[PDB]
Design a binder for this molecule. Structure first.
Ligand SMILES: C[C@@H]1CC[C@@]2(OC1)O[C@H]1C[C@H]3[C@@H]4CC=C5C[C@@H](OCCC(CO[C@@H]6O[C@H](CO)[C@@H](O[C@H]7O[C@H](CO)[C@@H](O)[C@H](O)[C@H]7O)[C@H](O)[C@H]6O)CO[C@@H]6O[C@H](CO)[C@@H](O[C@H]7O[C@H](CO)[C@@H](O)[C@H](O)[C@H]7O)[C@H](O)[C@H]6O)CC[C@]5(C)[C@H]4CC[C@]3(C)[C@H]1[C@@H]2C
Ligand SMILES: C[C@@H]1CC[C@@]2(OC1)O[C@H]1C[C@H]3[C@@H]4CC=C5C[C@@H](OCCC(CO[C@@H]6O[C@H](CO)[C@@H](O[C@H]7O[C@H](CO)[C@@H](O)[C@H](O)[C@H]7O)[C@H](O)[C@H]6O)CO[C@@H]6O[C@H](CO)[C@@H](O[C@H]7O[C@H](CO)[C@@H](O)[C@H](O)[C@H]7O)[C@H](O)[C@H]6O)CC[C@]5(C)[C@H]4CC[C@]3(C)[C@H]1[C@@H]2C
Ligand SMILES: *[C@@H]1O[C@H](CO)[C@@H](O[C@@H]2O[C@H](CO)[C@@H](O)[C@H](O)[C@H]2NC(C)=O)[C@H](O)[C@H]1NC(C)=O
Ligand SMILES: *[C@@H]1O[C@H](CO)[C@@H](O[C@@H]2O[C@H](CO)[C@@H](O)[C@H](O)[C@H]2NC(C)=O)[C@H](O)[C@H]1NC(C)=O
Ligand SMILES: *[C@@H]1O[C@H](CO)[C@@H](O[C@@H]2O[C@H](CO)[C@@H](O)[C@H](O)[C@H]2NC(C)=O)[C@H](O)[C@H]1NC(C)=O
Ligand SMILES: *[C@@H]1O[C@H](CO)[C@@H](O[C@@H]2O[C@H](CO)[C@@H](O)[C@H](O)[C@H]2NC(C)=O)[C@H](O)[C@H]1NC(C)=O
Ligand SMILES: [Cl-]
Ligand SMILES: [Cl-]
Lengths: 537, 537
């Protein structure tokens, strides 16, 4: 065993924590919640994990720290009852995170890389979502049946290229910071066309003007034809909101200033179907026709605080997958507690700095465009890249693919280790594998359980389920670290400096309050199931 | 044991089959799906149950038919493995049917009996649904905590008044048929105010006219003020759909004729947010303003075939709850197979005749008004009653309450009988009860499981889950009746005339195809769970 702290503990944690939601759902979160409540969300979601890392350090400073994975540590240091629960919940969390990463990759591919690589098209006027759900499901089944056979053939090639996917993440982060620094002096040019407070999708028209001049003649634009249903300048079928207000271009990225960070400081939540609006523009009040409603930027899902906590939270998970190399380390009780806490601190500072950066540079209306409908169907993050937006797009695609492949390689190892331990004979048949030690049947089971995550067909709907399972895993870790101190069992002696039982109780209570925040109904169900099993034994 | 077929078997089945969906969700189903596809739905949903009744008759013509409930028949005649599965699924079906009946009673009370007995009000312009969901949850918790303590005190009083709730059902049916017969000669008067194809909610304005004459002077009506935002007759802020089309009153119930049954013969499905339209009216095309969209009849939920099958199906369940008196009968192997099949035939003929009746008499636009927003917030069914619409309203309220009370008295008996049998020790603590034999802890468990059904807070969302659980119960009944014939076990000799194994296989396949129709995702989950338990043993 010859492994240091850096390439043994810190780098697997920092490859597992970073991922998809920093590139897809962060600018939306900032522009919806405000910089203040965004920092509140990041501060809350990083204190469940820090106290869980303290409890895992108390796991790590006891006994022998047995070799292989992170399962056997809990299984030998806390009894089988907590160990099976933590292993099963971490298994379910990894298998649904695979489905989340696949859906992220397909969202990036369909809306940004290849727009005409779409099978289903939005027939009719409304319902551009059901076609999108059917369009996500097909490519999800294709990529899942591809990337399970790739794992079924090429484990050694996946472990060989395990560093390139982390390299793509770090290059893509540094590009964001370089463009954000340069945006103080010379901003890029991404113009936003608006009409009063209402912003409108630039993808369907050519030029942002009410009337243009061609051939020494004032002719109505194509934008006149989309709102007035006639190319004549003296008609009265125009809705009075197009008539009483004017069309204005603003800079989408105005550069880093105090005024921009002042404007995007407070929360502007929206209901499903509302139109994204500024606050400081003249806008005369008039009613709008219904047939011009797809000529705007419409908020997709309902936004609140408890939605955004549940969407943000799996950006911070990935602690337990830094102890998979626990046998290979030289001093296992030293590299684990230092390494995981350093990784969590670095990633949390990255999120704080990125929230402040996106709030300071990019204007909030471009921030409130999920899918980037306000700027030319581009990434809102990618407009802040310095060399080109394609750096973030390509690095995000390969990072999501690498994370999905690493989840699909990791989870059957855990189910293999649970099945071979004979803790539960109901899973006994999943102890069968190849002659190399690689699993055979458990790959099929994770391929089928991750399929049900794919068929929900949205990033924003799979993410609260991941929040639920990882919060159950961390809560049982904190219960097992607190009860063993409070009940005074022998062979439980934590040789850690900063450990005390009130920190584990605060971790338990905070990760339970987050569980009731993120989605209260299934937490209310899981309370009933766990209370029923408590009434049995 | 002195019980005949009529008051022993036929009357409990006919009290359990009839219920809430004949009074709330039948006219909506006819007006959405057409008479043809409605008869197709009724014909499909009654052939799962008829073949299941043939299989239960093959249960009934074997052995001794042991005393007490319907659980012990399957448990002693088919082994414990199928018996525990059928008992547990029928338990879950009864406990969620309690929540469905409570939500039906609260819907009838809030929208028809007492409109100002509402805590939450629709604040803002849109989102009249979230206030309604919060308004259903509160009264659901109140009525559930009332009607569990009523069962906890008054079992003898509930069993005493068990016939009055059936009497209310039959009086309410005969009132419908009397008004439907009289509607040939003299129809009632329920006028429907429309504007082109679009119909509009009469509840917010007074008179259906564009301009009225008061004091020898043409003055714009209040209906002019709701569409034009000004009481002046020469303004131009009116949307062109109000300007180019005219306001017309039609009879809502035009009387039974060939032309009415001709018009409502084909399916008119609608998407969420569309406006209910006729087919044979002049209507000039023009765009409509957005601020007049609550002045119409808007379809609440998305409508298709697989939605309507899942909503309709628990109107036919209630077979197994006709064998609860199996010990009390004189000849148990005679009254059960004749009685249950006669009950199913009578209720199915009631549904066929009622579908043809509602299609023939009531006009389809009033049929397509879920909650009755087109006619004065009245029941669409109740406008067809002869003496008064209040007969149907009061009988429907007391029938839903009686059905909920009977479900809450029935389900803990079944969990008691499962727990005392020691088939599953994990439920062993639910064998404790009173000194009378009445259960104590299992009442709390059915009160908490039915609570999670209440918190979904819609009739149309709880009903597919009931469809799922009762289809799983009937499918395991057909599997257990087919495998025992095909595997040639002794002590399985059905002394029934019309029994053959292909009927049980057709029942299995049809109740499985209905399971994939009603909601495919949770059926796809249940397939995985059952296939995993199959791979264990
Ligand atoms: C130990 C051993 C290992 C293996 C095993 O056990 C043994 O492990 C267990 C673990 C099991 C799994 C545990 C949890 C599960 C999650 C569960 O999902 C619950 C709800 C969610 C799924 O929603 C469903 O999604 C499907 C597909 O869309 C819907 O079906 C629809 O499909 C079509 C569409 O074309 C159409 O017919 C209908 O739409 C419908 O049929 C279902 O209806 C739907 O319920 C999460 O979805 C929730 O949906 C809400 C929408 O109302 C959404 O609310 C918000 O929605 C939008 C946001 O997008 C906003 O407008 C608003 O803010 C809100 O309205 C919620 O956000 C969202 O949470 C499914 C089962 C599963 C996976 C368990 C499977 C078994 C399991 C693996 C076992 C094994 C055996
Ligand atoms: C043997 C022993 C006995 C006891 C026990 O085991 C041991 O028995 C088992 C059995 C277990 C139960 C098994 C099944 C269960 C059903 C499961 O529900 C699945 C989905 C449904 C619930 O939907 C959820 O509803 C809640 C509440 O609304 C939502 O939460 C929301 O709440 C607020 C609103 O204010 C807000 O925050 C968000 O909206 C959200 O948080 C959940 O999100 C939601 O998932 C059915 O709902 C489905 O929802 C679809 C909407 O997308 C709908 O699709 C259609 O929707 C409308 C129609 O209304 C149309 O526009 C379209 O046509 C479609 O979009 C679907 O129709 C609908 O199906 C919950 C668990 C439960 C009860 C199990 C509990 C445990 C259990 C009893 C065990 C015990 C231990
Ligand atoms: C939209 O912008 C135009 C500018 O082209 C505004 O027009 C006004 O025009 C008159 C004479 O042309 C000027 O005296 C006013 O100062 C202009 N008002 C401004 C610049 O606010 C028009 O009023 C604008 N519409 C709005 C703000 O609703
Ligand atoms: C954008 O402008 C409108 C007026 O042109 C602002 O006013 C609101 O408009 C809505 C229409 O849906 C009304 O319901 C509100 O009563 C109006 N509020 C007022 C007049 O205070 C609207 O607030 C602006 N949007 C912003 C500032 O985000
Ligand atoms: C709505 O109804 C009115 C009837 O009051 C229609 O008015 C037309 O009126 C002229 C002269 O008053 C008649 O010669 C026409 O025969 C009427 N047309 C009819 C009765 O169809 C008006 O056209 C109607 N609007 C529609 C159908 O869009
Ligand atoms: C009611 O009348 C309208 C016209 O006044 C009919 O025409 C359709 O209107 C919709 C508007 O949403 C258009 O998208 C369609 O293209 C129109 N169809 C045509 C002109 O054939 C509408 O069909 C009528 N509703 C019915 C018959 O149910
Ligand atoms: Cl983790
Ligand atoms: Cl039944």
């Amino acid at each position: 065993p010859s492994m240091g702290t850096l390439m043994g503990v810190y780098l697997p944690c920092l490859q597992n924590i970073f991922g998809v939601i920093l590139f897809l759902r962060l600018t939306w979160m900032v522009g919806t919640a405000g910089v203040l409540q965004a920092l509140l969300i990041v501060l809350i979601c990083c204190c469940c994990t820090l106290l869980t890392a303290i409890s895992m350090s108390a796991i790590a400073t006891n006994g022998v720290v047995p070799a292989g994975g992170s399962y056997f540590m809990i299984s030998r240091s806390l009894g089988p009852e907590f160990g099976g629960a933590v292993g099963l919940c971490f298994y379910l969390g990894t298998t649904f995170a695979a489905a989340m990463y696949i859906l992220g990759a397909i969202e990036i591919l369909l809306t940004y890389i290849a727009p005409p690589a779409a099978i289903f098209y939005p027939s009719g006027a409304h319902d551009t979502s059901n076609a999108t759900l059917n369009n996500m499901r097909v490519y999800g089944t294709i990529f899942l049946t591809f990337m399970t056979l790739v794992v079924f053939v090429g484990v050694k090639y996946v472990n060989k290229f395990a560093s390139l996917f982390l390299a793509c993440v770090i290059i893509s982060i540094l590009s964001i910071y370089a463009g954000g620094i340069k945006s103080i002096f010379d901003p890029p040019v991404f113009p936003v066309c608006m009409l009063g407070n209402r912003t409108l999708s630039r993808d369907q028209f050519d030029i942002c003007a009410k009337t243009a001049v061609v051939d020494n003649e004032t002719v109505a634009t194509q934008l006149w034809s989309f709102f007035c249903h006639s190319p004549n300048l003296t008609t009265d079928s125009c809705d009075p909101y197009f008539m009483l207000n004017n069309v204005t271009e603003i800079p989408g990225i105005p550069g880093a200033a105090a005024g921009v960070l002042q404007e995007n400081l407070w929360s502007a939540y929206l209901e499903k179907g509302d139109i994204v609006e500024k606050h400081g523009l003249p806008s005369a009040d008039a009613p709008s026709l219904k047939e011009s409603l797809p000529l705007y930027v419409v908020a997709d899902i309902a936004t609140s605080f408890t939605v955004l906590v549940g969407i943000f939270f799996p950006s911070v998970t990935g602690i337990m997958a830094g102890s998979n190399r626990s046998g290979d380390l030289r001093d296992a009780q030293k590299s684990i507690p230092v390494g995981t806490i350093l990784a969590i601190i670095t990633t949390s500072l990255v999120y704080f700095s990125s929230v402040v950066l996106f709030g300071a540079c990019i204007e909030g209306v471009v921030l409130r465009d999920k899918y980037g409908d306000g700027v030319s169907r581009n990434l809102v993050v990618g407009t802040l890249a310095w060399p080109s937006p394609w750096v973030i797009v390509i690095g995000s695609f390969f990072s999501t693919c690498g994370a999905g492949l690493q989840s699909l390689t990791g989870a059957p190892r855990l189910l293999q280790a649970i099945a071979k331990d004979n803790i539960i004979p109901f899973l006994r048949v999943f102890g069968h594998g190849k002659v190399n030690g690689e699993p055979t049947w458990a790959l099929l089971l994770t391929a089928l359980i991750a399929e049900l995550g794919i068929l929900i067909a949205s990033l924003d709907m799979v993410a609260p389920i991941l929040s639920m399972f990882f919060l159950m895993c961390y809560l049982f870790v904190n219960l097992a670290c607190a009860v063993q101190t409070l009940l005074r069992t022998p062979n439980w002696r934590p040789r850690f400096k900063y450990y005390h039982w009130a920190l584990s109780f605060l971790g338990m209570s905070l990760c339970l309050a987050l569980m009731f925040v993120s989605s209260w109904y299934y937490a209310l169900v899981a309370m009933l199931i766990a209370g029923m099993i408590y009434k049995y034994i």
